[PDB]
Ligand binder design. Structure first.
Ligand SMILES: c1ccc2cnncc2c1
Ligand SMILES: [Cl-]
Ligand SMILES: [Cl-]
Ligand SMILES: [Cl-]
Ligand SMILES: [Cl-]
Length: 280
């Protein structure tokens, strides 16, 4: 698929940088014809077929195809796509309140209601995606952004569909591997992956929201991955003494090694607590 090849600078002005990763950089921008503001994500293209630098066109097209399908309050909206010889540039909805990761870091520890207020929105977004048979595969606090961080109950959007895949056969078997602290055991073990992997990631996020601590984090990436595969975590009393037994139950039912036994997104919404990769 071909994208707009006009110079993006003829249609947008850029400003502050919003995110910077291994293969992409995001800049705030403003559309000249409307004055509306967006986030421009510049994804570096691969320059030779056999290279490891940049992102393959297949991977870029997949991300764009998924973003084009989705529209929901708890997921980012794609506005348009440009490209040139070096980059594919995604003009995405601007989410101005920053990452949930930074909100958690800057703010004192959350209450159980503050945690569930964020969590219910994440679950609604993931319910939408899974209903579409879309696995995100990179859910974590850095990939959730707040619309306005200065309200009592911030609204959020899920971002970063760089690893997302359509799961039309129940599972996929491809080169898919997220951030060590959040990946499911099936990712660590290079097994076929489905929607269940996201549910594990939600369990990790929930643990962090309630405690400020990461359940499987080791001193090295290999330790973290070994802890995940062995389901080596526990609820530390120092951090969970004020947390309800029902919150711990919710987590326990997500941090399950066998993906078939793990709660699904629909199970998570009906749960009583809610219902109303290498070192170098
Ligand atoms: C992707 C990555 C970073 C963003 C920052 N701010 N708004 C939207 C974004 C989308
Ligand atoms: Cl700007
Ligand atoms: Cl990146
Ligand atoms: Cl993104
Ligand atoms: Cl595919």
């Amino acid at each position: 698929t071909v994208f707009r090849q006009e110079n993006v600078d003829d249609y947008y002005d850029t400003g502050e940088e919003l995110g910077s990763g291994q293969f992409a950089v995001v800049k705030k921008c403003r559309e000249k014809s409307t004055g509306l503001q967006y986030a421009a994500k510049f994804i570096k293209k691969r320059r030779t077929k056999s290279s490891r630098r940049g992102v393959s066109r297949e991977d870029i097209e997949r991300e764009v195809s998924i973003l084009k399908e989705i529209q929901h309050p708890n997921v980012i909206t794609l506005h348009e796509v440009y490209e040139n010889k070096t980059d594919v540039i995604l003009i995405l909805e601007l989410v101005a309140g920053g990452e949930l990761f930074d909100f958690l870091a800057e703010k004192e520890s959350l209450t159980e209601e503050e945690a569930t207020e964020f969590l219910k929105q994440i679950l609604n977004g993931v319910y939408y995606l899974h209903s579409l048979q879309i696995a995100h595969f990179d859910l974590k606090p850095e990939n959730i952004m707040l619309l306005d961080r200065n309200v009592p109950k911030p609204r959020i959007k899920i971002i970063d569909f760089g690893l997302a895949h359509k799961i039309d056969f129940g599972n996929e078997f491809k080169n898919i591997f997220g951030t060590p602290e959040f990946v499911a055991p099936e990712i660590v073990n290079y097994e076929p992956l489905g929607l269940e992997a996201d549910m594990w990631s939600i369990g990790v996020i929930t643990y962090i929201l309630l405690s400020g601590a990461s359940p499987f984090l080791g001193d090295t990436k290999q330790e973290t991955l070994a802890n995940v595969s062995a389901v080596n975590y526990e609820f530390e009393d120092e951090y969970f003494s004020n947390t309800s037994a029902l919150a711990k139950d919710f987590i326990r039912r997500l941090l399950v090694k066998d993906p078939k036994k793990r709660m699904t997104i629909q199970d998570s919404l009906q749960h009583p607590w809610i219902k109303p990769q290498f070192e170098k």
